[PDB]
Design a protein around this ligand. Structure first.
Ligand SMILES: Cc1ccc2[nH]cc(C[C@H](N)C(=O)NC3CCN(Cc4c[nH]c5ccc(Cl)cc45)CC3)c2c1
Ligand SMILES: Nc1nc2c(ncn2[C@@H]2O[C@H](COP(=O)(O)OP(=O)(O)NP(=O)(O)O)[C@@H](O)[C@H]2O)c(=O)[nH]1
Ligand SMILES: [Mg+2]
Ligand code: NA
Lengths: 167, 469, 166
């Protein structure tokens, strides 16, 4: 029947990365979540009139298991590389995440999107122009998201699915 | 009829339940949300005990109440006023007779004594299982010692004297089995010859046993204080989660050591023997229910440097291909088969901790701290119950010890393993990948030949144990 | 995984807590810290079936004697423990048996009679007297030592089998 897309969220820990998938998969309109529930990471969606199933892997909290990253990444067809807009170090980490994805997938052209996440009201330290320039240097889209208002969340995942479809 | 209660003006815990102060889930009730006063009332309720709730509350309360304030509130809960004499008592006293005091005696027996004993049970659990609050705040400990040490009256005396002693023991602070542990197994390396210890010279059975003892001890040392509040992901993680981080860093180091043993063995035949030996270690990990060890091996086999070694895996025996495949399948579909296997085996076991970390973090991040109802902010207790269900599962697998004997030299060898040396992570993992490209170049580059590096026999002794008399 | 709610009852100091901690942790507790109410969980395979034991460890001291109905309502099966060097604890057994039957309104509650501290030589309750009582209740009698582990798994897992066949 319908196509299933295996998406993988990657990025630095401790800066609200998990809010992206929680807000997507959530009862959009009730702020609640049980991640232990079978298929709290699967969602049927309609993108450009075509129904598909998203299977999202987000291992948030396991960042210290650094030798497991290859195994987790190889499961994915497309990747969201996430940094926090108030944490410059998480932005500087993006280059090495992208290089690792390319190595694991053995391809110089892996579907991926760059996501800048606003996880609190602390001062922004990565300007949108810096992130746009980085994304353009890689040839990938840039999406900014809020961890509190759900703004940008659908755009981030749907843009990635379009990158897979147009690969 | 029900017992009458003190006036809510003199005793705050007698206010009636309402949706403005407590909400229940849809045979004791389960609390969805409430004020801290209502949570403490139900924590110490006169009608029933709720030991699960005591553990849940003491594990998670610091997200909504400071330790000093909790102690003040349970002392306030403890100090229950007694009712005045009734009309019948008054009339007896006016005639010079002793009153029956029926209502007073019932209130003591059915309200004061159960509530007071349940307050003491909170204190007892707090000191026995959450003593870090007192290690980190000496004044909190002084207040607890003073409260317990000044409780009067004989109904509580046995538990007051006991809790005083427990506190004093905790301030200055052995296993028995159904059978004997199996005999330690040796291969090329002999006892005491630590300089020869290596992947192929130690017995693969004993490698798996000693790593399982080490990994079990690391798993058993992680306390809930290292997990609640997602503190292992925050800036002070080295301060707040040191046992968890030590456990993860061991797992990472062993995975990288497996990768290094493989790709630094340049001769193809020797490298097949190395990979085959690691799969034998994985088989014994499976037999021991050491799932951390199983995934350490699977992670190494799926790493970029190792996964691409098609010439090596082509020569692995079919039975070992099947062992590795069924171990890999444990992690598929978001660990579906792993979760079912963990819940089916007979402990002792060593769980993989990473799933617990992700579920605690997402439960914290995906649920609000408070629920707003009728203009009031109520503590969202359902969120804390979900976190404590996870920490309770973790603790349940921490109880059972392995019936295996420690070998101090093999233990030290694995404790001191340091595959990265002084190299940084990127440096080192790039080195491993470049070694992989050296020993099995990308097509269409030809496959080179390399000299042997091991001077001892490569034949495995196998992983079925031996038993001399 | 089937879940079983076990409750350990008996007079103060007979070894209810030591028995439970020996089962849970393989450790013998030398101290005598009177319990108010404690609860433990254990995943274990019994007769080839995995289950989850919830074990409630209750207060034996007489000062807590008015607080028992609430835990007897929730328990599926009861370990009724006395100490074989304490005749009063054996005489207290029938009071627990009768209260459990009243609360659960049943003549057919899963129970096991446990004679603990069987590592001690100086016995004052003979096995025959306890076995006679057990037969009158229709339940098995198992002698245990929380110190040596003798009989400990047998007592708890026999109770599980009773609940399963109930
Ligand atoms: C289980 C197994 C082992 C050796 C194997 N040789 C050949 C097969 C048959 C399979 N259809 C095939 O052609 N597979 C590819 C080539 C071989 N690697 C092995 C491999 C490396 N790292 C791994 C981590 C996990 C797993 Cl499951 C496997 C691996 C996988 C890709 C086979 C199967
Ligand atoms: N020799 C021996 N001593 C035991 C055994 N079981 C318990 N004890 C000892 O008896 C004392 C009381 O044990 P405990 O488990 O606290 O009893 P309890 O029945 O739980 N008491 P309470 O009802 O007050 O909670 C402790 O000193 C303990 O070490 C046993 O099997 N053998
Ligand atoms: Mg006890
Ligand atoms: Na910054």
């Amino acid at each position: 029947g319908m196509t299933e897309y295996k998406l993988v969220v990657v990025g630095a820990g401790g800066v609200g990365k998990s809010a992206l998938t929680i807000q997507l998969i959530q009862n959009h309109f009730v702020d609640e979540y049980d991640p232990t529930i079978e298929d709290s990471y699967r969602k049927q969606v309609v993108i450009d009139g075509e129904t598909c199933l998203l299977d999202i892997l987000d291992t948030a909290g396991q960042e210290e298991y650094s030798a497991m990253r290859d195994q987790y990444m190889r499961t994915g067809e497309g990747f969201l590389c996430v940094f926090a807009i108030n944490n410059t170090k998480s932005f500087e980490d993006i280059h090495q995440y992208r290089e690792q994805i390319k190595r694991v997938k053995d391809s110089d052209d892996v579907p991926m999107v760059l996501v800048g996440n606003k996880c609190d009201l602390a001062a922004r330290t990565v300007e949108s122009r810096q992130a746009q320039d980085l994304a353009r240097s890689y040839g990938i889209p840039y999406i900014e998201t809020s961890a509190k208002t759900r703004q940008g969340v659908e755009d981030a995942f749907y843009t990635l699915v379009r990158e897979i479809r147009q690969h | 009829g029900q017992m009458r209660l003190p006036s809510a003006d003199v005793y705050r815990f007698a206010e009636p339940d309402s949706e403005e102060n407590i909400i229940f889930e849809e045979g004791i009730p389960i609390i969805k949300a409430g004020t801290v006063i209502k949570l403490i009332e139900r924590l110490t309720y006169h009608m029933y005990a709720d030991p699960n709730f005591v553990r849940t509350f003491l594990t998670t309360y610091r997200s909504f109440c400071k330790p000093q304030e909790l102690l003040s509130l349970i002392i306030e809960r403890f100090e229950i006023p007694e009712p005045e004499p009734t009309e019948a008592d008054r009339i007896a006293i006016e005639n010079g007779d002793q009153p029956l005091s029926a209502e007073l005696k019932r209130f003591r027996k059915e309200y004061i004594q159960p509530v007071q004993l349940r307050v003491l049970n909170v204190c007892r659990h707090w000191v026995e299982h959450h003593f870090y609050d007192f290690e980190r705040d000496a004044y909190l400990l002084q207040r607890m010692e003073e409260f317990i040490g000044t409780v009067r009256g004989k109904a509580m005396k046995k538990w007051v004297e006991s809790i005083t002693k427990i506190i004093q023991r905790k301030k200055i602070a052995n296993i028995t089995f159904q059978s004997s542990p199996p005999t330690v197994e040796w291969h090329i390396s002999r006892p005491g010859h630590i300089e020869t210890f290596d992947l192929l010279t130690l017995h693969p059975i004993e490698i798996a046993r000693q790593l399982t003892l080490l990994e079990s001890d690391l798993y058993r040392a992680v306390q809930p204080s290292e997990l609640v509040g997602s503190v292992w992901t925050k800036e002070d993680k080295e301060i707040n989660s040191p046992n968890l981080l030590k456990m993860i860093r061991h797992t990472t180091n062993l995975t990288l050591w497996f990768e290094k043993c493989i790709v630094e063995t340049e001769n193809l035949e020797e490298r097949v023997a190395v990979v085959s030996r690691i799969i034998e270690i994985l088989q014994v990990f499976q037999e021991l229910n050491n799932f951390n060890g199983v995934l350490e091996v699977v992670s190494a086999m799926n790493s970029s440097p190792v996964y691409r070694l098609d010439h090596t895996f082509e020569q692995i025996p079919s039975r070992q291909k099947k062992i590795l495949e069924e171990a890999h399948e444990l992690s598929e579909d978001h660990y579906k088969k792993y979760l079912a296997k963990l819940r089916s085996i007979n402990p002792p076991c060593v769980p993989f901790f990473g799933i617990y970390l992700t579920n605690i973090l997402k439960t914290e991040e995906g649920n609000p701290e408070v629920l707003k109802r009728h203009g009031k902010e109520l503590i969202n207790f359902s969120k804390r119950r979900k976190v404590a269900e996870i920490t309770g599962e973790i603790q349940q697998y921490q109880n059972q010890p392995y019936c295996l004997r420690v070998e101090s030299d093999i233990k030290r060898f694995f404790e001191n393993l340091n595959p990265m040396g002084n190299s940084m992570e990127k440096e080192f993992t790039d080195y491993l990948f470049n070694k992989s490209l050296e020993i099995e170049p990308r097509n269409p580059k030809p496959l080179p030949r390399f000299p042997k590096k091991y001077s001892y026999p490569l034949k495995s002794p196998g992983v079925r144990p031996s038993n001399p008399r």
